[PDB]
Design a protein around this ligand. Structure first.
Ligand SMILES: [Cl-]
Ligand SMILES: [Cl-]
Ligand SMILES: [Cl-]
Ligand SMILES: [Cl-]
Length: 137
């Protein structure tokens, strides 16, 4: 139950190097989705591991297994679909497939994510929506 879930969240966080902000259990109670995605930010394309919790998105770089890269309160997170074959114009550019944009409205920063398959993209969309609906009731 809820106590076990907190314990598991803190175990998870303990293995992240360079954690920023409050501890995961201050805002979160369970992990809703995780997965490896390609992230394009200012034209640099890299693999990241993304974790969606209630109230929070966290992304990290693999290799302390994970290195902290960012967090977004889901209240300030917006999403925009990108249709397959659309160009991302940052640095020398990239063709986006199974992708979407994440907008951090607190920082006014945008980046592209890409999943491996349309099913995996669909799963992320559903997870993000479900998280948003929980908070809305
Ligand atoms: Cl429990
Ligand atoms: Cl990053
Ligand atoms: Cl929201
Ligand atoms: Cl949105």
């Amino acid at each position: 139950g809820e106590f076990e879930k907190l314990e598991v969240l803190e175990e998870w966080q303990s293995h992240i190097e360079g954690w920023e902000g409050s501890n995961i259990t201050d805002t979160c109670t369970e992990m809703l989705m995780c997965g490896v995605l390609l992230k394009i930010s200012s034209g640099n394309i890299q693999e990241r591991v993304f974790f969606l919790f209630d109230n929070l998105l966290v992304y990290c770089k693999r290799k302390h297994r994970y290195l902290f890269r960012g967090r977004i309160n889901t209240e300030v997170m917006e999403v925009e679909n990108v249709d397959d074959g659309t160009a991302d114009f940052h640095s020398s550019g990239h063709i986006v497939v199974n992708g979407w944009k994440i907008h951090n409205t607190a920082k006014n920063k945008w980046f592209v994510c890409m999943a491996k398959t349309p099913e995996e993209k669909h799963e992320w969309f559903e997870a993000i929506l479900k998280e948003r609906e929980r908070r809305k009731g």
